[PDB]
Design an enzyme around this catalytic site. Sequence first.
Site, short mmCIF file in Angstrom:
data_model
loop_
_atom_site.label_atom_id
_atom_site.label_comp_id
_atom_site.label_asym_id
_atom_site.label_seq_id
_atom_site.Cartn_x
_atom_site.Cartn_y
_atom_site.Cartn_z
N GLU A 1 0.82 -1.19 0.00
CA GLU A 1 0.00 0.00 0.00
C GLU A 1 0.85 1.24 0.00
O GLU A 1 0.59 2.13 -0.80
CB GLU A 1 -0.96 0.02 1.17
CG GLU A 1 -2.05 -1.05 1.03
CD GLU A 1 -3.07 -0.70 -0.05
OE1 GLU A 1 -2.95 0.37 -0.72
OE2 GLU A 1 -3.97 -1.52 -0.27
N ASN B 1 -7.50 8.65 -5.96
CA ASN B 1 -8.30 7.67 -6.62
C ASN B 1 -9.10 8.31 -7.76
O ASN B 1 -9.42 9.54 -7.72
CB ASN B 1 -9.27 7.00 -5.62
CG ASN B 1 -8.57 6.40 -4.44
OD1 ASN B 1 -7.59 5.67 -4.61
ND2 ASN B 1 -9.07 6.70 -3.24
N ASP C 1 -12.15 8.26 -8.40
CA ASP C 1 -13.44 8.95 -8.00
C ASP C 1 -13.26 10.30 -7.33
O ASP C 1 -14.25 10.91 -6.89
CB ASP C 1 -14.28 8.02 -7.12
CG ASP C 1 -13.64 7.76 -5.77
OD1 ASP C 1 -12.50 8.21 -5.52
OD2 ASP C 1 -14.28 7.06 -4.99
N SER D 1 -11.51 10.74 -4.52
CA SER D 1 -11.08 10.55 -3.15
C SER D 1 -9.55 10.36 -3.19
O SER D 1 -8.93 10.31 -4.28
CB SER D 1 -11.77 9.35 -2.52
OG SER D 1 -11.40 8.22 -3.22
N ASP E 1 -6.26 8.22 -0.88
CA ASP E 1 -5.79 7.28 0.08
C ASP E 1 -4.62 7.87 0.88
O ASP E 1 -3.70 8.40 0.29
CB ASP E 1 -5.33 6.02 -0.67
CG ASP E 1 -6.51 5.12 -1.12
OD1 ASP E 1 -7.69 5.42 -0.81
OD2 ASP E 1 -6.23 4.05 -1.71
N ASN F 1 -8.93 5.43 2.76
CA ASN F 1 -9.69 6.16 1.78
C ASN F 1 -10.57 7.25 2.41
O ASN F 1 -11.40 6.94 3.27
CB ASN F 1 -10.55 5.14 0.94
CG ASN F 1 -10.99 5.70 -0.40
OD1 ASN F 1 -10.94 6.86 -0.61
ND2 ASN F 1 -11.45 4.83 -1.31
#
Length: 129
Positions: free
Chosen positions: A35, A46, A48, A50, A52, A59
């Site tokens: 990650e 991301n 969309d 958003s 991380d 998220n």
Amino acid sequence: KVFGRCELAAAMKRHGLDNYRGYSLGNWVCAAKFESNFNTQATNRNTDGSTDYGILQINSRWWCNDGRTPGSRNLCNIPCSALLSSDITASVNCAKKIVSDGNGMNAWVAWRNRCKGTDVQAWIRGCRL
Ligand SMILES: [Au+]
């Protein structure tokens, strides 16, 4: 902070992630590796809109407020920047609520594609725990 592998395993264990909801310590260490590369400062957008945040790439769509993820939730009740601290408390406690929400570690795409069904024990090999 960029943690060392055993250094992160020790912190995660101290913070109770070790066999938390049945996921051995090596699953958590493997997830962190893939990650964030063990880097508490890691951020990644991301598709969309958003983002991380942190060592476990938590998220903003659901878990934290970053001030730029419209119509999203903040279920860990924290600013996402808290997830970037050298101290992993906020990340680990938030992760406990994530993994507990019914889909387990599958919430972490890197874990599902790179850690699940592998010998994750290797992630804690050599560590004094
Ligand atoms: Au083994």
